[PDB]
């Protein structure tokens, strides 16, 4: 994930909805566990501490992610993925002949 970054609106929403203050923890099978047993499993090695917790939920359907920018050769700004998005029109499509087909109104 390099073309996009975390949006500032979502970061502000998460910050002052305090969703990181209400984390949920999981064991290696992805089942909700109390923070005490999560700590005990992480210390024992039975849980990977990295991918085993969630930052609650942010409400309001905000865009989580915004395009990231970089510097072109002349010092102008540009979106990272705008210019290397595509080069060929992928050929396609295929026009299948299906004149014998009863459509439904």
């Amino acid at each position: 994930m390099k073309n996009f970054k975390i949006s500032s609106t979502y970061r502000a929403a998460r910050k002052q909805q305090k969703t990181a203050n209400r984390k949920s923890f999981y064991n290696d099978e992805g089942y909700m566990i109390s923070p005490s047993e999560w700590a005990d499993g992480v210390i024992k090695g039975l849980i990977n501490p990295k991918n085993s917790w969630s930052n609650d939920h942010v409400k309001g359907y905000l865009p989580r992610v915004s395009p990231r920018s970089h510097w072109t050769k002349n010092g102008y700004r540009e979106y990272l993925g705008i210019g290397k998005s595509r080069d060929i029109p992928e050929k396609e499509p295929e026009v299948i002949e299906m004149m014998d087909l009863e459509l439904v109104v």
Partner: protein, 352 residues
């Protein structure tokens, strides 16, 4: 006293029906812009005549390949095998089979197999289509789609299987409705109609599609498959003759319930009576979603992959196809990112 109907199924999207088995990456070869699935017995028989049986056995035994010894093409390249006549079959490369490069990273490690018979020919079982028809009929009948369909006398809610009476009763007339509806399976179709789609999930909160490591063997869009449905009573005859206009009512409720929360270009259009068949179409296509709302999400509230709100939309990737109809040229999907609503199909039912 028997009524026979013919149900013609036209897939509008990839359709996968599994058997519980999965191809591993040590079982297929990605080359010449195709996925070749050889027969393991024929491969092993040709590999014992080349004095590489022990090498192949060590290749297959190894439980922890690092990154590249997990692919069969690595074995075929290191040991200098040029023959490719091992039986089996092939699937034409689409391009939209994995979001990464299939020959570079781990990529397609496992492929969910399509259901096949003893001859290795894929077909659609009659039990699968019967389950889809039963979901359509149960969701559009108000005497079955009510709160009495939930068995609350237990630790957690479940379905009331006795809501539609089935089985024999002591001293009572036989009252099995769905024994009268008899859905036969299909004549097997060819492996030329199979593709290698991948699971993408579209979230209404994230507003983007996220790919997942779940690759399936699916029927290509615009495949014609015929079923015969037999009815032995009168009520079931009315039900099956009303399979369309009940599929339309079910799809109208499904669109007003779930599909209206997603962009219109991600939702496909119907040529005939809609239906959702096989894996990947979602939970609401397989439940009485009016009564399963709330219960289904709370079943996953304590899992890491939590079901949020009404869930995500399942959108596989498959090549864009135009069709020629009386109205002109019809695009199967309205988007240019090549996103098919996974599991969608259309049907027409006649009274042969």
């Amino acid at each position: 006293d028997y009524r026979t109907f013919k149900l013609s199924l036209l897939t509008l999207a990839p359709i996968h029906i599994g058997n519980g088995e999965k191809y591993t990456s040590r079982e297929f070869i990605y080359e010449n812009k195709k996925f070749y699935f050889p027969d393991m017995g024929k491969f092993y028989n040709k590999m014992v005549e080349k004095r590489l049986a022990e090498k192949f056995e060590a290749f297959l035994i190894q439980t922890r390949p690092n990154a590249r010894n997990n692919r069969l093409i690595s074995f075929l390249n290191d040991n200098r095998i040029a023959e490719r006549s091992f039986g089996g079959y092939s699937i034409s490369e689409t391009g939209l089979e994995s979001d990464r490069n299939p020959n570079s990273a781990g990529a397609i490690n496992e492929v969910n197999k399509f259901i096949r018979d003893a001859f290795g020919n894929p077909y659609i079982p009659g039990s699968s289509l019967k389950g889809a028809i039963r979901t359509i009929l149960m969701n559009t009948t108000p005497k079955w789609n009510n709160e009495n369909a939930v068995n609350d006398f237990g630790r957690f809610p479940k379905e009331n299987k006795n809501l539609i009476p089935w089985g024999p009763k002591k001293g009572k007339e036989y009252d099995d409705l769905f024994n009268a509806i008899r859905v036969s399976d299909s004549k097997p179709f060819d492996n030329k109609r199979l593709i290698l789609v991948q699971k993408w999930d579209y979230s209404a909160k994230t507003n983007k599609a996220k790919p997942l490591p779940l690759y399936r063997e699916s029927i290509s869009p615009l495949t014609k498959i015929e079923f015969e449905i037999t009815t032995t009573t009168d009520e079931a005859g009315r039900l099956i003759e009303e399979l369309g206009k009940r599929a339309q009512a079910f799809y109208k409720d499904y669109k007003a319930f779930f599909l209206s929360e997603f962009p219109d270009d991600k939702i496909q259009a119907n040529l005939q009576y809609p239906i959702y068949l096989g894996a990947g179409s979602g939970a609401w296509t397989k439940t009485l979603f009016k009564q399963a709302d709330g219960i289904l999400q709370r079943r996953y509230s304590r899992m890491k992959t939590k079901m949020v709100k009404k869930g995500v939309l399942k959108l596989t990737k498959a090549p864009l196809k135009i069709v020629k109809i009386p109205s002109g040229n019809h695009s199967l999907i309205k988007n240019h990112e090549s996103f098919y609503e996974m599991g969608k199909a259309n049907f027409m039912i006649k009274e042969i």
